[PDB]
Amino acid sequence: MRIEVVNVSHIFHRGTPLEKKALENVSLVINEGECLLVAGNTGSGKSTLLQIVAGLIEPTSGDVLYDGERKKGYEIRRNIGIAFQYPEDQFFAERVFDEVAFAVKNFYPDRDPVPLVKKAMEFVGLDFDSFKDRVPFFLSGGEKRRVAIASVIVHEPDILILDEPLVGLDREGKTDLLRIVEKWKTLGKTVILISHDIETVINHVDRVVVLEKGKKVFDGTRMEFLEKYDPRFFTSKMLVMRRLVLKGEDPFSMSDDELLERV
Amino acid sequence: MRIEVVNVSHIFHRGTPLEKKALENVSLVINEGECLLVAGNTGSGKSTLLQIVAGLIEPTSGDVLYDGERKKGYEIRRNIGIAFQYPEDQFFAERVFDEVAFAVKNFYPDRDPVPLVKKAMEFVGLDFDSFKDRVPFFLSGGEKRRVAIASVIVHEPDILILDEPLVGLDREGKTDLLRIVEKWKTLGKTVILISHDIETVINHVDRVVVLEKGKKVFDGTRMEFLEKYDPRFFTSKMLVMRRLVLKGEDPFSMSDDELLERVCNS
Amino acid sequence: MRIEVVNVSHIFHRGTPLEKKALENVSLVINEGECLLVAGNTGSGKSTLLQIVAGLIEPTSGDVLYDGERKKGYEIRRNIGIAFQYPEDQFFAERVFDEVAFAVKNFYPDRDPVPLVKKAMEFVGLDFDSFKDRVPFFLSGGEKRRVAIASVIVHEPDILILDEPLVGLDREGKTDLLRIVEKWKTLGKTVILISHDIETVINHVDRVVVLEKGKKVFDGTRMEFLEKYDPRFFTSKMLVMRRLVLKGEDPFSMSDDELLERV
Amino acid sequence: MRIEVVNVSHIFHRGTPLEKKALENVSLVINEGECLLVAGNTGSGKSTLLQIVAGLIEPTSGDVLYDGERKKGYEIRRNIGIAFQYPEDQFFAERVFDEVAFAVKNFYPDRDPVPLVKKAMEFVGLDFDSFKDRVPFFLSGGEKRRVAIASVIVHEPDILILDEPLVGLDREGKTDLLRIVEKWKTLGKTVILISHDIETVINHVDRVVVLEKGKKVFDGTRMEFLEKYDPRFFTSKMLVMRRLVLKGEDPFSMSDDELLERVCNS
Amino acid sequence: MRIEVVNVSHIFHRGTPLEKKALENVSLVINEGECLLVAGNTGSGKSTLLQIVAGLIEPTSGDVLYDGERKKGYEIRRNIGIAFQYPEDQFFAERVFDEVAFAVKNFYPDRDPVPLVKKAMEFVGLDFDSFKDRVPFFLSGGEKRRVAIASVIVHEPDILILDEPLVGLDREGKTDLLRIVEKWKTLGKTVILISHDIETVINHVDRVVVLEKGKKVFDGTRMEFLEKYDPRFFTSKMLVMRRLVLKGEDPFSMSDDELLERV
Amino acid sequence: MRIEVVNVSHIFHRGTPLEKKALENVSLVINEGECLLVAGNTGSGKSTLLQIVAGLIEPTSGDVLYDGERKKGYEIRRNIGIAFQYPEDQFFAERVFDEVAFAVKNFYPDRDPVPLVKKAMEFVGLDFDSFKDRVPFFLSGGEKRRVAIASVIVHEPDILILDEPLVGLDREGKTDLLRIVEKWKTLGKTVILISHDIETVINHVDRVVVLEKGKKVFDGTRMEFLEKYDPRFFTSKMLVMRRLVLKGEDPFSMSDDELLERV
Amino acid sequence: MRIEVVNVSHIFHRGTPLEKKALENVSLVINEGECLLVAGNTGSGKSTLLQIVAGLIEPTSGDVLYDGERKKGYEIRRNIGIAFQYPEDQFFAERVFDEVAFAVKNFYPDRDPVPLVKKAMEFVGLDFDSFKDRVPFFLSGGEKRRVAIASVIVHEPDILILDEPLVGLDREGKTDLLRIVEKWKTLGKTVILISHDIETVINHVDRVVVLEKGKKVFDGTRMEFLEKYDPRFFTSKMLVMRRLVLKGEDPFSMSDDELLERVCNS
């Protein structure tokens, strides 16, 4: 599903004394099968933006086009998978099977859940018979995170939207979660993420958009990002990737031999 | 629309102890497309003059000709969009669209106001979709001023009059205001600005008229103004610009430092 | 202009924590040339209602039809004359002429104001040459009130809307103001009023609508009103008019011989 | 404090075309403790009279004696608490305590205002703890009026003057207002009410003075008033009360139906 | 009266969803008889600050000390004269005398107003008998402005506080108004002002405080101000005064011979 | 602990546009060891009231006295046990022991939890070794409810406050929960409850207070309540208990022989 | 307070299919004043270990000695302030003062909590007067975290344990958090940090302990850690720091570029 944000503004509680501006005149396109990072500081409004693309928020101004068509939230919702941070903390079910199955039973009650579940559990690396009857709460932290992700791809959305999927995760969790994201991209599906951890995620993304106080201030590929975006708050290794990039090579292929201070 | 003011005088509250002669024998020509600044002290008659030109006040004596013809005010109101000071104080509407759209409905009672509304908003630098459902009360100072201008020009009068358009606005407000003035001019239409303070609008006009106690004391170009008008109340920057309008050198735009370096290398 | 309110609700600041309900499911019709009193206690929402009919407020739900057509505020505004209490306190002008002329110069800049002004001043009982150059502020209280009214009928609306025109007025003021209202009705134009002083105004009205906590609870003629509405807060003479009415006579014709305790 | 008004006249804007004689040769006595209603049309001079009595306006001619003595206004201001119409429109404070407390600090600059503030609030029926940190802007119409009264009487003047105290208030507002008047009277202190409409305050006063175009035309008791004053503008209820003040029968309180049954069983 | 602001913060509507931060940890002292300019952009909070010193706003945190004592608003109010912009637009009275007299009659009903009025009118340059009976509204713009100022010094506050006294004024008005301010300072009384027109007013001030998003970012003399403060938004002549100052001379004494590009 | 509410008012968001009145001038006393029902309709403010007594809300006006002393929330909090409806839905722990122990470990970290836990579990009818290691989530509905109650009496408050403890409970749950309340009263401790189910709970209470739009409108014993309070919304059997009471007998002792229509 | 952990093992949910051995035979010494980072994967047992040390969990086997003595948890709770992850989620109060003050009242039931509250607020960098009447719900993420810390240390325990103190915070939040850690250390008191990610806290500690699946696999200094611990999961920056901890050169502070230039000029 092609996504296009066209001149979107958002103001919470528009026309009241508690009116708060979140986004201003934001436009951008996400081609089917792109992985996009949306970044920015404190109150950039990026989370509002993801929620607007997800159809959870009707923006005060502008539109999101879906395959070149305008669409209400309720209309495209079945096509979106969205998770927030610590999604395990929203587990409702006593068996893994029901936790995974919830979205298809809710979104497509007239499709057989069993095969959609099997397939989501397998894609995420959870053996169907070995997990389907377990209590989600007593899964290991890794297994839980896999269940959470299975439960937002089970209905086969065109778009996977992850708001801070990495917060609270150790290096092993991150690697596995970002592995599942690679397989999603391999299917030709779209993924959109916010993550404070720009350094970990840039290796898995095609484009970066940066918001700043509700405004789009950068929109380009990951190459253009480290080459051109303000490097003020770049980590050590991002800054090494930058020099490298700053006319030269593609540091994203490289593996920690990366030290090309070889001048 | 050519405007010519012919021997206009005006008096308020005649015969009473409140009597004030606002204007005395003022004559003035304004040609299609001119950028004119009208200046002088508070109470020099400057606003009252443009209220008359606009057709809001019928003058005590003398006449305004419009394309050479005598007209009662209401006959030419349509040709002239006039914004008073703080024109935003006149809002009635709960959204930007309705306020601007209001100004369409008399002249075009059967026409769908959207296209005109959208050109007026866009003219004053207010993205249509972004502002059309904004509640005017909740806008910034500069955006309010612009919505008020939009509703003055929505029907596309030939002439725009702004009474002290810069007042109360911050830095970006002003730049946005002056951007409206530059556009109107680019279109070849007449714009008149009324301001006591010349320094911050002289760079955006072609000529300057000055009123003192109801009388015209200067009427010339901005170059003529800096050369010949009583310099006694010129700001410091005005005195530099003038210092170097003597014997030649056009001070306008140039640049600010490019101004000073060039003065007493005289 | 026929006015019809169809299932109107209004909630201020809808969808925020400071959302306040003003009207609920209010419907009513005002035929051209009717004088209508809208009554009710503290927070009935009647003032919201008048403002909704005047097009000053877009109601959250339902519609007002104008000659059987739906109309935005901006569209019918030139057709409405509305004043609030102490309208003299909003005089802006130095001469009566400009105070009266303001609405036509604003609403119909391409119509000659002079004759519209003459005619509004005469209708209200203000000699054109004797008042047109006076300072509105130093008019007598009576003359001021006449100027105020001239300034909301000058553009010849179909609808005159008076929110509490009587507050702050002495008996002489009331009589004169209600005199002007009689002449307005005589033209076949519509008038809508709220006034705490139900007893004074009922003599000048055709119908009464009562709101109560945002709801329409009465809608009928002035005869039906004293006959059928809750008489709890009826003044002495209203209550005498009621008995009289309570199968019997029309006490509105009568003049203080009215004491038909003649049993 | 005994008040006696002696041959007072007053003119605004003399010599000008705005000239208005507000008062003409008015004489009036007000004894300690009296409940007085001053009535007449808007522009009869009624407010201007009590502004003079209060010491706010120095009159054109004649004098007000206070306990028999001549005093300049500022010499007796302290003795007289006067509330203008909508006295709540004068609030400056962000809480009920501070507004009322303000009125203590001049007269008692070194005294802790709490006790007086608390008596004034309590006097006007505003539980102290309940209202002291209330933001006056957010109060009801009747409660605002009462906070404004509280700040007028906080220092305990001998005389209270209320200009049209009932205006704009609902049913319970009025009852609360009139409760203040009854208390002040129970204390034996002078209260004067200024109102064009007699019917809704006559039951709460002892006497009625009427002004017409700056002149006193009636000065008597409420019983005398219903009997002898020009009846032409009496409300219907006033006409019943009067009908039965003829040949005897005191109409006051009585009861409302207990009024009618008793009229033409005459 | 010594004024000291000690660690003042202000948050409007503290502890609600419409809580808005105005000031943070602002401290400063104003010695008796100083003229102080408070400057800053859009939403610096300077107007909140003046209102806090005036006792009109109880700040959420910190205190203002008056002669080294903490004081509620109601306690120091008689000692403050404060005007806002276009103060003539708040004239209530029919004669100049009553307009001027209002504050003393309100603040000190037991002091004779007549001499306090005479003296305020004379200080401002308004002949007592020539103006006391005039209608304030029909005074000339200059005379009006003089009346306004007379009406906030009549009660003889220790502190004069002017919020944007210069907006809407022509050069002649400015000069006269700033003349009255010189005479106030000459009495040894304190004046505090905000004015967008830093260039006009700096010639009349001793110190400048700059706020920026609720924070004090500059506090010093007028000399230190042009020498040290960010000159980004300095006018032409301020910038000339700066160079001059930037180790060198006192450009505030000088009169437009000032062009010491004499190198 | 004697509890006294003295002239309490509460207004949420006092002094802002979203200010909402909850309570007005409410006074009442609860003697140590009383069981009190607080009743009232929709927006009576009773839940605000309980929260005020619990010290969770500082009331805008008035005070709550604790043993005749005024006390901040933080000061009396260790002395209060409060639960809301469906308290099991707030279980955080993996073992019953930790769920029960939480309040004492938080409130009195320097007292041995083990015996306080044993004792709370036994009082509620939960065998220590048979439940202490179970997973609270897989307890039966009855057992869960017992755990919840154990966890708010473990620290031995003087005051037990139950906001709607009965919602969602079947007859068996109700009887058991109200059994535990009887044992609490038997200790001489205070209990305060709100419960829509006035008919079930009246049998277990000493006094009833009724709020109505923020005002106290009834305050008396359970006998006085059915005898004197508005019986409009009394259930069938309450209304039978009333007649009975209406000079006569004590229907609370009786057991469904209660049908004394025996005339 | 010296802490020594002796052969501690711990098991949850024994005998059940939910059984998990959290800890296996862990021994550890922590001396007065040490800055210790405890690391390892989620589920390595790191939090459960410090919950035991803190006295919240009685361990399955082995013992913690406190100054050499056996103590039940509740006997030493007072000595150890432990903040769990997102300790702000535990707020009950409507203002910052009450929340922090709550933590005073058990230990000092008769003492006025102000002085302690004020030191705790000030310790965590929250100006007392500025925050004491702040409604905790409305604070920023970093300020909330700090109020929660303040209420953990208000009674001044000898030992502070922070479970993942940096989580969810922005850039300035982190700097403010780490400033608390540096202060506690300057005072000579023991601080232990529990974090899976070493890179962003290693510069603020003296030693590192690593747990894997309930077992201690490393216990040494930060210098020893970079040298000797399994390097396979070291971030790039950690690999540089380590590259140059080989044969000498202390990588800590130094500076970030001052790091790289110095690596393969090896």
Curated annotation (Swiss-Prot), chains B, D, G:
Pfam families: ABC_tran (PF00005). It is found in: Cell inner membrane. InterPro entries: AAA+_ATPase, ABC_transporter-like_ATP-bd, ABC_transporter-like_CS, ABC_transpr_CbiO/EcfA_su, ECF_ABC_transporter_ATP-bd, P-loop_NTPase. PROSITE patterns: ABC_TRANSPORTER_1, ABC_TRANSPORTER_2. Its EC number is 7.-.-.-. One of its GO terms (molecular function) is ATP binding. ATP binds at residues 43-48. Residues 3-238 form the ABC transporter domain. Residues 220-266 are annotated as: Required for heterodimer formation. One of its GO terms (biological process) is riboflavin transport. Its main location: membrane. Transmembrane segments: none annotated. Keywords: ATP-binding, Cell inner membrane, Cell membrane, Membrane, Nucleotide-binding, Translocase, Transport. It is a peripheral membrane protein. ATP-binding (A) component of a common energy-coupling factor (ECF) ABC-transporter complex. Unlike classic ABC transporters this ECF transporter provides the energy necessary to transport a number of different substrates. Expression of the complex plus RibU in E.coli allows riboflavin uptake; uptake does not occur in the absence of RibU or the EcfA1A2T complex. PANTHER family: ENERGY-COUPLING FACTOR TRANSPORTER ATP-BINDING PROTEIN ECFA2, HEAVY METAL TRANSPORTER. Belongs to the ABC transporter superfamily. Energy-coupling factor EcfA family. This is Energy-coupling factor transporter ATP-binding protein EcfA2. It comes from Thermotoga maritima (strain ATCC 43589 / DSM 3109 / JCM 10099 / NBRC 100826 / MSB8). The gene is ecfA2.
